Amino acid sequence: FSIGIGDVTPGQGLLKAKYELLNAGYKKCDEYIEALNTGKLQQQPGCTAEETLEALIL
């Protein structure tokens, strides 16, 4: 019963999906940053606008 570097190496089906996920998430994060700084950002109830931005990015 053994573990090697071939057991934590990522396949191709992960290296495509990770690239798509990072591009989608960074686009939505950039649109939230732009919606705070130079426009209207929909403030969540019970908090300031920057805390809304922190919650959306997390």
Partner: protein, 107 residues
């Protein structure tokens, strides 16, 4: 507000004389008769109204011949203007539309 003596530059206090109330120095003869209305406004910060207007508030600003909202092109929307900070701010305009199968928030 702090006001200071042209002579010695100590701080003035308000007192009452035989004909007027006076600004008077405590350490030199200088006095200044208050002849006319003088004021000093603080203008403090009011409460946030963002969550106060959400959820079918008691708005009233709607009027006859009011404009339709630009998306739905129906007058089924309220609009209001409020100061967000103190009343020296120029009032901002905002509007929200609520119709069947249609929820949106606009500025």
């Amino acid at each position: 507000m702090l006001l200071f003596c042209p002579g010695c530059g100590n701080g003035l206090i308000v007192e009452e004389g035989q004909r007027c109330h006076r600004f008077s120095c405590n350490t030199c003869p200088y006095v200044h008769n208050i002849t006319r209305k003088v004021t000093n406004r603080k203008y403090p910060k009011l409460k946030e109204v963002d969550d106060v207007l959400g959820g079918a508030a008691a708005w009233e600003n709607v009027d006859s011949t009011a404009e339709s909202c630009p998306k739905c092109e129906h007058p089924r929307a309220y609009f209001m203007q409020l100061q967000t900070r103190s009343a020296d701010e120029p009032m901002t305009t905002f509007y929200k539309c609520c119709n069947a199968q249609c929820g949106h928030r606009w500025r």
